[PDB]
Amino acid sequence: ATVGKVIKCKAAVAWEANKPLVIEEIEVDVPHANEIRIKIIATGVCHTDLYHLFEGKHKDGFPVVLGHEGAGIVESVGPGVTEFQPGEKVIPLFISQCGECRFCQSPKTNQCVKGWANESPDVMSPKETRFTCKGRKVLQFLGTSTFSQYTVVNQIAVAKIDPSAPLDTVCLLGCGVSTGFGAAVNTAKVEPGSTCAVFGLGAVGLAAVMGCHSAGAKRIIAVDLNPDKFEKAKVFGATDFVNPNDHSEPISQVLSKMTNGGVDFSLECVGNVGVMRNALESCLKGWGVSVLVGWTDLHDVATRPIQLIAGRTWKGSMFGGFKGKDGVPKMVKAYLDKKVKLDEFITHRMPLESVNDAIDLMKHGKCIRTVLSL
Amino acid sequence: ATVGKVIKCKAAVAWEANKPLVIEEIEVDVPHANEIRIKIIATGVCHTDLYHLFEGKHKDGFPVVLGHEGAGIVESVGPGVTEFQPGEKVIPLFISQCGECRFCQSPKTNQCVKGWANESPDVMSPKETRFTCKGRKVLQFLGTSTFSQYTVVNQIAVAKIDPSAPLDTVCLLGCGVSTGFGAAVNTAKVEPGSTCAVFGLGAVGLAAVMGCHSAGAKRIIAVDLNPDKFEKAKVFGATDFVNPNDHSEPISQVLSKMTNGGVDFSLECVGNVGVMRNALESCLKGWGVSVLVGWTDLHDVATRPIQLIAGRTWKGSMFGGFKGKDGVPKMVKAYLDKKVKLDEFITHRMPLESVNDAIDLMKHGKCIRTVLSL
Numbered sequence: 001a002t003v004g005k006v007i008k009c010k011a012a013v014a015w016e017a018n019k020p021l022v023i024e025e026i027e028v029d030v031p032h033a034n035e036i037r038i039k040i041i042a043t044g045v046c047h048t049d050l051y052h053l054f055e056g057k058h059k060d061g062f063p064v065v066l067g068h069e070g071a072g073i074v075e076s077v078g079p080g081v082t083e084f085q086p087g088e089k090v091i092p093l094f095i096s097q098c099g100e101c102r103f104c105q106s107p108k109t110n111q112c113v114k115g116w117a118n119e120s121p122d123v124m125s126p127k128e129t130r131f132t133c134k135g136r137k138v139l140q141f142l143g144t145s146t147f148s149q150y151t152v153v154n155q156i157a158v159a160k161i162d163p164s165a166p167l168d169t170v171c172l173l174g175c176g177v178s179t180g181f182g183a184a185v186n187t188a189k190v191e192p193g194s195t196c197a198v199f200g201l202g203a204v205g206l207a208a209v210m211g212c213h214s215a216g217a218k219r220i221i222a223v224d225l226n227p228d229k230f231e232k233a234k235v236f237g238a239t240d241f242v243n244p245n246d247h248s249e250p251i252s253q254v255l256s257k258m259t260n261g262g263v264d265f266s267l268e269c270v271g272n273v274g275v276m277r278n279a280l281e282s283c284l285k286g287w288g289v290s291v292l293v294g295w296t297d298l299h300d301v302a303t304r305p306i307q308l309i310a311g312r313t314w315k316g317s318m319f320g321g322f323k324g325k326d327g328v329p330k331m332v333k334a335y336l337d338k339k340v341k342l343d344e345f346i347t348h349r350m351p352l353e354s355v356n357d358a359i360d361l362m363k364h365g366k367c368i369r370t371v372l373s374l
Numbered sequence: 375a376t377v378g379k380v381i382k383c384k385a386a387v388a389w390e391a392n393k394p395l396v397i398e399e400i401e402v403d404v405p406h407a408n409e410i411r412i413k414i415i416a417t418g419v420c421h422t423d424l425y426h427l428f429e430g431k432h433k434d435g436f437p438v439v440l441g442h443e444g445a446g447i448v449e450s451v452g453p454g455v456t457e458f459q460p461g462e463k464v465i466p467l468f469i470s471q472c473g474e475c476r477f478c479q480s481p482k483t484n485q486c487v488k489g490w491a492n493e494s495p496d497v498m499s500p501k502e503t504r505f506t507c508k509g510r511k512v513l514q515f516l517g518t519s520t521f522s523q524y525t526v527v528n529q530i531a532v533a534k535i536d537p538s539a540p541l542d543t544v545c546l547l548g549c550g551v552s553t554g555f556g557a558a559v560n561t562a563k564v565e566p567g568s569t570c571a572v573f574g575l576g577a578v579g580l581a582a583v584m585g586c587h588s589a590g591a592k593r594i595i596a597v598d599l600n601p602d603k604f605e606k607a608k609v610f611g612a613t614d615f616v617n618p619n620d621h622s623e624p625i626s627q628v629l630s631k632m633t634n635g636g637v638d639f640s641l642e643c644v645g646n647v648g649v650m651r652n653a654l655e656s657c658l659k660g661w662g663v664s665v666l667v668g669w670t671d672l673h674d675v676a677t678r679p680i681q682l683i684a685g686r687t688w689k690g691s692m693f694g695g696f697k698g699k700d701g702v703p704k705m706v707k708a709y710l711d712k713k714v715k716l717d718e719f720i721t722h723r724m725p726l727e728s729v730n731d732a733i734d735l736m737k738h739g740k741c742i743r744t745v746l747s748l
């Protein structure tokens with residue numbers, strides 16, 4: 001019925017900044033050369049979707065269909081597409097892997113010259129769109145737009161996964177889980193037997209703890225202001241639990257005492273510059289490594305020159321440093337092989353129509369992840 | 375004729391901050407357990423000597439004998455010493471290598487648990503001193519105090535060198551040349567065929583240029599506000615020369631445009647937090663590595679989180695990442711084997727009595743290195 005034809009379906013639309021989303025009937029165009037049309041089965045809600053909704057003065061960033069944590073099935077492919085075919089399970093990616101540039105061929109990064117981030121980062125979505133609604137063009141957030149029953153993505157931003165994978169759970173691999181896990185594994189490169197510290201225990205932080213654990217860290221200290229987050233952190237692998245509010249001296253001093261000078265690796269999963277500094281200063285001199293995972297821009301992050309001169313290394317990453325087309329398929333298999341957890345992240349589930357309820361919980365830090373059905 | 379006796383000799387003493395030095399007759403006590411008494415034959419003047427005297431000026435760090443880039447002959451050793459004997463050529467060090475702690479045992483660092491830094495870091499001198507003058511105790515800068523005919527340094531902070539080494543030149547290895555060269559080769563790990571940028575062209579920056587050349591870099595851009603240094607930069611292997619004042623755009627933009635994005639490796643060798651930020655940002659996304667070498671503890675260094683999240687790495691270096699007793703002897707052998715340059719760093723030579731003149735030259739960037747006779 002659908003193949004070779006324009007589709008009419010439902011989608012959560014953000015017509016403008018600071019306004020609740022409205023579920024609309026949109027038209028999805030057929031896939032053009034080097035593109036794939038996907039029927040989305042599930043999608044997580046991430047803090048980056050809210051950042052755009054609440055913090056975008058960029059009028060040209062709207063109207064837009066948000067979402068970048070989904071999983072689905074190939075409905076059709078555009079001209080010149082041999083890589084994919086109808087029926088295969090896939091996961092759209094917010095970063096590209098053209099596989100031909102200087103960055104794609106280097107094992108040191110997951111960067112690329114293609115994608116909206118290089119073409120148009122200001123509006124946070126590609127210039128070209130395959131969505132229309134009430135005669136108006138509606139943008140595709142990060143080139144993924146998973147808050148729609150049907151989406152169209154360029155093949156260099158699509159990962160083919162195991163045909164047995166559960167779409168209503170693996171969808172988190174599109175962003176959140178891969179970010180925390182990879183930051184520990186790929187970026188920090190946590191080693192067996194080491195001591196680690198993770199700041200912030202949301203989905204990114206919890207995934208970071210799981211990453212430290214998979215790498216074989218001997219000690220993993222989970223740090224968070226909210227003591228209600230400790231039980232899940234234990235389930236993911238953390239060995240120690242520290243609440244900064246419980247100590248009058250800076251958190252770096254506390255961790256320093258507990259570890260005899262600081263940890264081997266630390267990861268910031270809050271997105272606060274004051275936490276970013278303490279995270280670095282909590283590391284041991286000589287070989288301590290700290291990774292900025294959480295992000296903000298409103299403010300500069302800073303430290304005293306001696307911190308780095310004494311031997312510490314400061315790094316950062318996007319999407320956990322994973323080269324998408326290679327990393328996501330491996331993570332799907334790891335979950336299926338029982339080496340990686342995912343179910344434990346999903347605290348709420350609700351229909352696409354309840355998207356505003358999901359945004360509110362997230363806004364008030366009332367959940368880890370909320371997965372929506374489409 | 376001096377063994378077992380207190381020595382009276384000449385030393386340039388700084389009674390207080392911001393004041394010119396005074397050639398005084400001081401008493402040098404006999405070496406205590408595990409210590410070496412050394413007759414200094416030559417010592418260079420480094421900007422770090424000026425930092426304490428003019429910038430930091432820590433109030434409890436005076437009176438003091440500065441100097442930490444010398445070379446000499448062993449005069450006598452304290453009990454427990456078997457590695458050194460009178461008449462052997464040595465180079466004192468501003469950092470320790472006890473060889474038994476966790477840091478000394480790791481190939482990842484040149485840190486140690488001993489030294490003035492681990493007890494009196496802000497003072498810039500150990501708590502104990504072997505110098506006396508006018509019945510007043512006088513501190514030994516960095517535990518080396520080379521602006522004296524005779525000094526006393528603990529053995530873990532002294533490197534023994536080749537018997538045929540020219541003391542009037544190898545003294546540069548005491549700090550400046552090992553620092554710069556090392557920061558490139560050891561800390562940044564410059565790769566063959568890569569592109570680099572060195573900010574600041576004094577002896578440390580010029581040594582950094584040399585290191586980039588030794589590592590086989592394809593392009594080395596020298597950056598300095600004072601264009602008079604470009605000639606020596608070329609001597610040491612630089613391929614490009616940029617004076618920030620000749621461009622309206624911020625320096626980071628000039629470099630990016632010159633390289634189509636940014637350089638692979640960069641190094642700051644000035645001691646200015648603003649320059650430190652610029653060096654980091656002149657690096658390419660994905661795999662760019664920037665290293666701090668300049669010294670200051672009066673201000674914080676900063677940047678935007680995105681700089682690191684895009685794929686950049688920020689590090690710092692202390693004495694070029696060389697393990698004192700291991701690295702220095704090898705650098706001497708390299709100079710003797712015609713693999714590294716040293717003489718080209720020495721632009722001025724003058725007696726100890728002219729110390730204030732050498733300092734003044736440095737103060738006005740009117741020299742690379744001035745080396746004193748005693």
Ligand SMILES: NC(=O)c1ccc[n+]([C@@H]2O[C@H](COP(=O)([O-])OP(=O)(O)OC[C@H]3O[C@@H](n4cnc5c(N)ncnc54)[C@H](O)[C@@H]3O)[C@@H](O)[C@H]2O)c1
Nearest residue numbers: 200201202203204224225226270271293294295317318319
């Ligand atoms: N690098 C990437 O690819 C990428 C992608 C998406 C999101 N992010 C970042 O991930 C960050 C967090 O994501 P999340 O979904 O887990 O968020 P979340 O809001 O679910 O969790 C954040 C946690 O941090 C804790 N916290 C806050 N201040 C703290 C402090 N001062 N000290 C200790 N703990 C503190 C909170 O109590 C909370 O438990 C965001 O800020 C975002 O910028 C990064």
Ligand SMILES: NC(=O)c1ccc[n+]([C@@H]2O[C@H](COP(=O)([O-])OP(=O)(O)OC[C@H]3O[C@@H](n4cnc5c(N)ncnc54)[C@H](O)[C@@H]3O)[C@@H](O)[C@H]2O)c1
Nearest residue numbers: 421422553574575576577578598599644645668669692693
């Ligand atoms: N990390 C260590 O172990 C270590 C060792 C030795 C020296 N240091 C520090 O190294 C720094 C330099 O030492 P030095 O003796 O070579 O100094 P120097 O004063 O001889 O050279 C500094 C050079 O930087 C240049 N410069 C100043 N501002 C600049 C700018 N804005 N842009 C580009 N160039 C600029 C100056 O013109 C000068 O040529 C100092 O801060 C010193 O304290 C650290």
Ligand SMILES: [Zn+2]
Nearest residue numbers: 098101104112
């Ligand atoms: Zn690419």
Ligand SMILES: [Zn+2]
Nearest residue numbers: 046048175176
């Ligand atoms: Zn996200």
Ligand SMILES: [Zn+2]
Nearest residue numbers: 420422549550
């Ligand atoms: Zn020095």
Ligand SMILES: [Zn+2]
Nearest residue numbers: 472475478486
């Ligand atoms: Zn040691």
